[PDB]
């Protein structure tokens, strides 16, 4: 037999967004691989949040962040008013198949 | 209304509520239909009955990118009773009553706030003006006025007196020259930076942005397109210019593109044409992203069917607004207080605010009651 | 000569601006490399997209928009206004060629664009676009150290500067590359100091300062050891462009070059190769040194039948689409 065993990951805050116009947070799976953070090739769903505000969700922030299961998280300074971002992080879900 | 007589058209006018709008976060179509562009970063008095302080619709336009001409609408702050009340609709959909979060609907002081669909928020007041605010795909505002206020208002949307040459009348008694020069007289805060006139078309920057914006925004003026039905009524040239400018300048090209197409559709439907099925191969990610158990609808022309409403009526459904599109529960279904979409058989009748389950016979005050199909009946 | 009207992109995301600044910006999408952006009407808009070949930083596509002409160079092909064309393609004011080791696009009175097709890409601009440009190539005002990285009075960093001049595709959201950690390696064996400071570029030291080039050499040495010579070649190009005469720094080991049998690889040979189609073309030329293949002095190039370089007396002639070997004659009814 073979059954899927799946679990969440921990929190990954690999950058601190920079003040200015081009600044922000760019937490990408390729950057995660380069920095040595373990990146699962296959996944089901991922969760992004603000690291300094661990309660209020993303939509309650109202800031322009794009966060997707294929790429990761991106917040650009120039797209928000004031032209800044918060310090975000994210976590992923890894599932393997274990013999029964 | 015009009658064919005397060899001519004898035309009388039915009263028409005026309509201001801010679309694309930059373009403004006033009550006199003087379309003009506004690239500003401040809070601007969108409209105000400048005899008194009865109502004051404010709009906060905020710069959204590298370029000074990259703006998004970010809030709509209806001040009221001379600032005693302030209903602030943000861009995420959050509604703040007197700087306090207030979910929707809400009915108090004759003010009614509700969402006809997931794309729009209706702020209906008894003072005369109605606000209809769009959140999806981005933030746009529409304002309706009972024509009684004709030739009385001030602000960005102009004095509503059927004259396009007086729209730039400032508080100093002269007609201003251009858009930005006029707007920089209506800023809310003296510390804001004055808006600047923009000649450089963002369309000239990227050739791929060029071809994308052209190939999509050209769907407006195509005589075989869904939009053709409104061409013989509304000239689509300003809307095509808006679509071009948005998509070329917008970092999220699809968002601003679909905002422009939605704006054209909504304006035409305000004039009384039901443009339908115009999202062929375009803007379909707004079909799919709907909340679960809901679905898209092109003609949403009433309140949202609710179990509470069918049980005990509702103040919400007594407001007439232009038929907007968006995500709603399908016909024959209702959303319970939980918000999930269930048929009438699964949602309960409500007596005195008590959840009285469907198909349940009960006793109350010497009477026998039943809850059939969500409908409450009592006997004896 | 081409003193301060040049910018370039080479090696590991190394950008050299008009006024001499060098920095590293490891972007991976499109950016406004240069654009006439301080004028009523734009004249040129040159952009690059930088990608990876396995690991080597390369330029994967260049888009030059100029005066209603769109030129997209990528995948070893050139698109002129949306149509592929066979090099060279020439029109009034514009000429694009596979000349030498590169693809060169020259728009007369506008710009000169050299693109080796793998990493390097160099822009020469007219003096008239002083102060009216903006992009990774800088402001072209002549002041290197004060006006490039100061946006709204705030001094910013190469990552910030290279990210401000960004431009996404219509449906693309490219990230921003994160800062690379500290460096290592350095110039241990002194190869960068042995060559760059060597005799080959003696007078080049009098024209172009090598400090940034030394650092870039060390950084590339941290990268693959088959790719350290990009900085050297760029320094040769810059020394040539400032006006100086570089010397042949290459050796059979220092990124050796190969040329056809009669044809030799020279640093700073005359750009106008005398060819017995026009065997005295090099007479009153005005163009600085150019690297590439050449012919030994005395024997001109043979472009009539492509037989290498031939002596002035042994190469063919041409008449009306006919090629005549030496010794041949043809008599018209009148001559
Ligand atoms: C409506 O407005 C009037 C006048 O301000 C006020 O007296 C009344 O309480 C409000 N609400 C209703 C339901 O009439
Ligand atoms: C370039 O184009 C050729 C066909 O012309 C194709 O085979 C090749 O994969 C493309 N890319 C590269 C890197 O050569
Ligand atoms: C160069 O541009 C700056 C930017 O405003 C301007 O202040 C300066 O006068 C210009 N000088 C020249 C010589 O173009
Ligand atoms: C013209 O040229 C041909 C080819 O060399 C030659 O055979 C012929 O004799 C010439 N005519 C003369 C010399 O009158
Ligand atoms: Ca982070
Ligand atoms: Ca007016
Ligand atoms: Ca400068």
Identify whether the C-beta of residue C28 lies closer than 8 Å to the C-beta of residue C177: yes
Experiment type: cryo-EM
Select from B301, B255, B295, B296 the least CA-distant residue to B274. Answer: B301
**Residue with CA nearest ligand 3 atom 14:** C131
The Cα–Cα gap between B59 and B25 comes to: 10
CA–centroid distance, C330 to ligand 4, in Å, is 7
CA–centroid distance, C77 to ligand 2, in Å, is 9
Q: Inter-chain contact B66–C170, Cβ cutoff 8 Å? A: no
The Cα–Cα gap between B60 and B78 comes to: 11
The number of beta carbons lying within 10 Å of the beta carbon of residue C263 is 17
The Cα–Cα gap between B162 and B174 comes to: 17
What is the rounded (10 degree) CA torsion for B16, B17, B18, B20? -140
Q: Is C75 in the pocket of ligand 2 (CB under 6 A)?
A: yes
Identify whether the C-beta of residue B58 lies closer than 8 Å to the C-beta of residue B47: no
Q: CA torsion sign, C139 to C141 to C147 to C152?
A: negative
Select from C272, C311, C319, C271 the least CA-distant residue to C291. Answer: C271
**Element (H or E) spanning A25, and its range?**
strand A24-28
SS (H, E, C) C264-278: EEEEEECCCCCECCE
**Element (H or E) spanning C241, and its range?**
helix C229-242
- Report which bound ligand comes closest to the CA of C150: 7
Identify whether the C-beta of residue B134 lies closer than 8 Å to the C-beta of residue B143: no
Q: Read out DSSP for C58-109?
A: EEEEEEEEETTEEEEEETTEEEETTEE-PSPEEETTEEEE--TTSEEEEETT
**Most distant CA atoms of chain B, gap in Å:** 78
Q: Residue B27 is encoded by which pair of tokens?
A: 């373009």
The number of beta carbons lying within 10 Å of the beta carbon of residue B286 is 21
SS (H, E, C) chain B: CEEEECCEEEECCCCCCEEEEEECCCEEECCCCCCEECCCEEEEEEEECCCCCCEEEEEEEEECCCCCCCEEEEEEEEEECCCCEEEEEECCCCEEECCEECCCCEEECCEEEEEEECCEEEEECCCCEEEEEECCCCCEEEEEECHHHCCCCECCCCCCCCCCCCCCECCCCCECCCHHHHHCCCECCCCCECCCCCCCCHHHCCHHHHHHHHHHHCCCCCCCCCCHHHHCCCCCHHHHHHHHHHHHHCCCHHHHHHHHHHHHHHHHHHHCCCCCCCCCCCCCHHHHCCCCCCEEEEEECCCCCEHHHHHHCCCHHHCCCCCEEEEECCCCEEECCCCCEEEHHHCCEEECCEEECCCCCEEECCEEEEEECCEEEEEC
Identify whether the C-beta of residue B164 lies closer than 8 Å to the C-beta of residue B205: no
Pairing of strands B129-134, B140-145: antiparallel
Count of residues making up chain B: 380
The Cα–Cα gap between C128 and C140 comes to: 10
Which residues are near ligand 3 (CB < 6 Å)? Answer: C 130-131, 141
Q: Inter-chain contact C42–B212, Cβ cutoff 8 Å? A: no
Write out the E strands in C129-211. Answer: 150-151, 154-155
Q: Locate tokens 């592929």: which residue? A: C84
Q: Is C333 in the pocket of ligand 4 (CB under 6 A)?
A: no
Task: Provide φ and ψ at A33, rounded to 5°.
Answer: -65, -45
By three-state DSSP, how is residue C235 classified?
Answer: helix
The Cα–Cα gap between B218 and B203 comes to: 14
The Cα–Cα gap between B1 and C48 comes to: 59
Q: Chain A to chain B, count of Cβ pairs less than 8 Å apart?
A: 23
Provide the edge-to-edge strand list for the sheet that holds C83-84: C30-35, C44-53, C56-66, C69-74, C77-80, C83-84
Q: Residue B163 is encoded by which pair of tokens?
A: 């004259």
Residues 38-67 of A with CB under 8 A from B: 59-60, 62, 64
SS (H, E, C) B12-26: CCCCCCEEEEEECCC
The Cα–Cα gap between B286 and B119 comes to: 10
**Element (H or E) spanning C31, and its range?**
strand C30-35
Select from B67, B88, B74 the least CA-distant residue to B204. Answer: B67
Q: Is C329 in the pocket of ligand 4 (CB under 6 A)?
A: yes
Q: Residue B233 is encoded by which pair of tokens?
A: 């009524």
Cis peptide leading into B137, omega within 30 of 0? yes
How far is the CA of C183 from the CAs of A41, B329, C179, C220, C235, in angstroms?
A: 29, 59, 12, 11, 22
DSSP code of A87?
-
Identify whether the C-beta of residue B368 lies closer than 8 Å to the C-beta of residue B378: yes
The Cα–Cα gap between C150 and C128 comes to: 23
A99 CA: distance to closest CA in chain C (Å): 36
- Report which bound ligand comes closest to the CA of C74: 2
Q: Inter-chain contact C63–B207, Cβ cutoff 8 Å? A: yes
Q: Is B109 in the pocket of ligand 1 (CB under 6 A)?
A: yes
Whether residue C170 lies within 8 A of chain B, CB to CB, comes out as yes
- Report which bound ligand comes closest to the CA of C332: 4
- Contacts of residue C198, defined as CB under 8 A and 6 or more positions apart, other chains included, come to C249
Residues in chain B within 8 Å Cβ distance of A62: 90-92, 94
C91-100, Cβ contacts within 8 angstroms, sequence gap of 24 or more: C94/C69, C96/C71, C100/C290, C100/C291, C100/C292, C100/C293
Q: Residue B9 is encoded by which pair of tokens?
A: 């058209």
Task: Provide φ and ψ at B65, rounded to 5°.
Answer: -170, -170
Q: Inter-chain contact A60–B94, Cβ cutoff 8 Å? A: yes
Residues in chain B within 8 Å Cβ distance of A60: 92, 94
Resolution (A): 3.0
The Cα–Cα gap between B170 and B168 comes to: 6
Which residues lie across from B376 on neighbouring strands? B371
Which residues lie across from B164 on neighbouring strands? none
Residues in chain C within 8 Å Cβ distance of B207: 63, 65, 70, 72
Q: Inter-chain contact A74–C164, Cβ cutoff 8 Å? A: no
Q: Is C331 in the pocket of ligand 4 (CB under 6 A)?
A: yes
């Amino acid at each position: 037999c073979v059954r899927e065993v799946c679990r969440w990951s921990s929190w990954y805050n690999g950058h601190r967004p920079e003040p200015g116009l081009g600044g922000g947070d760019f937490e990408t799976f390729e950057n995660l691989r380069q920095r040595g953070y373990q990146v699962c090739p296959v996944l089901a769903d991922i969760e992004c949040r603000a690291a300094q505000l661990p309660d209020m969700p993303l939509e309650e922030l109202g800031q322009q962040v794009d966060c997707d299961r294929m790429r990761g998280l991106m917040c650009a300074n120039s797209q928000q008013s004031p032209p800044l971002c918060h310090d975000y992080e994210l976590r992923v879900l890894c599932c393997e198949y274990v013999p029964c | 209304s015009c009658t064919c007589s005397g060899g001519l058209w004898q035309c009388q006018d039915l009263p028409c509520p005026g309509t201001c709008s801010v679309q694309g976060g930059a373009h403004i179509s006033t009550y006199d239909e003087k379309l003009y562009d506004l690239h500003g970063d401040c809070s601007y008095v969108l409209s105000k009955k400048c005899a008194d302080s009865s109502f004051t619709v404010l709009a906060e336009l905020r710069k959204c990118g590298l370029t000074d001409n990259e703006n998004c609408l970010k809030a709509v702050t209806l001040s009221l009773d001379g600032g005693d009340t302030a209903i602030r609709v943000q861009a995420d959909g959050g509604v703040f009553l007197n700087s306090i979060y207030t979910q929707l609907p809400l009915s108090a002081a004759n003010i009614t706030l509700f969402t006809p669909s997931s794309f729009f928020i209706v702020v209906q007041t008894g003072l005369g003006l109605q606000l209809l605010v769009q959140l999806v795909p981005l933030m746009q505002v529409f304002v309706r006025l009972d024509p009684a206020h004709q030739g009385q208002m001030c602000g960005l949307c102009g004095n509503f007196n059927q004259n396009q040459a007086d729209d730039f009348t400032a508080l100093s008694g002269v007609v201003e020259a251009t858009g930005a020069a006029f707007a920089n007289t209506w800023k809310a805060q003296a510390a804001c930076a004055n808006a600047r006139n923009s000649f450089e078309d963002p369309c000239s920057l990227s050739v791929e942005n060029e071809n994308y914006a052209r190939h999509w925004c050209s769907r407006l003026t195509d005589p075989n397109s869904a939009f053709s039905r409104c061409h013989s009524i509304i000239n689509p040239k300003p809307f095509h210019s808006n679509c071009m400018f948005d998509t070329c300048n917008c970092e999220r090209s699809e968002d601003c593109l679909c905002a422009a197409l939605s704006s054209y559709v909504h304006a035409c439907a305000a004039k009384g044409v039901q443009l339908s099925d115009w999202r062929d191969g375009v803007c379909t990610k707004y079909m799919q992203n709907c909340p679960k158990s809901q679905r898209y609808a092109y003609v949403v022309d009433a309140c949202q069917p609710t179990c509470r409403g069918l049980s005990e009526a509702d103040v919400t459904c007594s407001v007439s607004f232009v038929p907007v599109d968006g995500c709603t529960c399908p016909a024959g279904t209702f959303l319970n207080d939980a918000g999930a979409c269930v048929p009438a058989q699964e949602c309960p009748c409500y007596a005195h605010g008590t959840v009285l389950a469907p198909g349940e016979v009960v006793h109350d005050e010497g009477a026998v009651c039943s809850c059939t199909g969500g409908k409450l009946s009592c006997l004896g | 000569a081409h003193n301060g009207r040049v910018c370039s992109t080479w090696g590991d995301f190394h950008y050299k601006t008009f006024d001499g600044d060098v920095f590293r910006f490891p972007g991976l999408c499109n950016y406004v490399f240069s654009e006439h952006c301080r004028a009523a009407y734009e004249d040129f808009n040159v952009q690059l997209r930088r990608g990876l070949v396995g690991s080597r930083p390369v330029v994967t596509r260049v888009v030059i928009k100029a005066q209603g002409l769109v030129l997209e160079a990528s995948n070893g092909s050139v698109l002129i206004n949306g149509q592929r064309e066979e090099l060279p393609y020439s029109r009034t004011g514009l000429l694009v060629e596979q000349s030498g080791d590169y693809i060169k696009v020259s728009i007369r009175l506008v710009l000169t664009f050299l693109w080796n097709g793998e990493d390097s890409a160099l822009l020469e601009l007219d003096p008239k676009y002083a102060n009216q440009t903006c992009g990774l190539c800088g402001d072209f005002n002549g002041l290197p150290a004060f006006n490039e990285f100061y946006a709204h009075n705030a001094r910013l960093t190469p990552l910030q500067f290279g990210n401000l001049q960004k431009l996404d595709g219509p449906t693309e959201q490219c990230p921003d590359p994160l800062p690379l950690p500290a460096g290592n390696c350095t110039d241990e064996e002194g190869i960068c100091h042995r060559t760059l400071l060597g005799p080959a570029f003696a007078e080049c030291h009098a024209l172009v300062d090598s400090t940034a080039y030394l650092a870039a050499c060390a950084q590339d040495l941290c990268r693959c050891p088959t790719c350290p010579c990009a900085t050297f070649v760029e320094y040769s190009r810059q020394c040539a462009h400032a006006g100086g005469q570089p010397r042949n720094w290459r050796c059979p080991e220092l990124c050796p070059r190969t040329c056809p049998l009669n044809m030799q690889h020279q640093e700073c040979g005359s750009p106008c190769t005398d060819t017995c189609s026009n065997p005295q073309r090099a007479q009153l030329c005005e163009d600085h040194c150019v690297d590439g293949c050449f012919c030994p002095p005395g024997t001109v190039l043979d472009d009539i039948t492509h037989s290498g370089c031939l002596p002035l007396g042994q190469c063919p002639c041409t008449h009306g689409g006919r090629t005549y070997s030496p010794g041949t004659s043809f008599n018209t009814t009148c001559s």
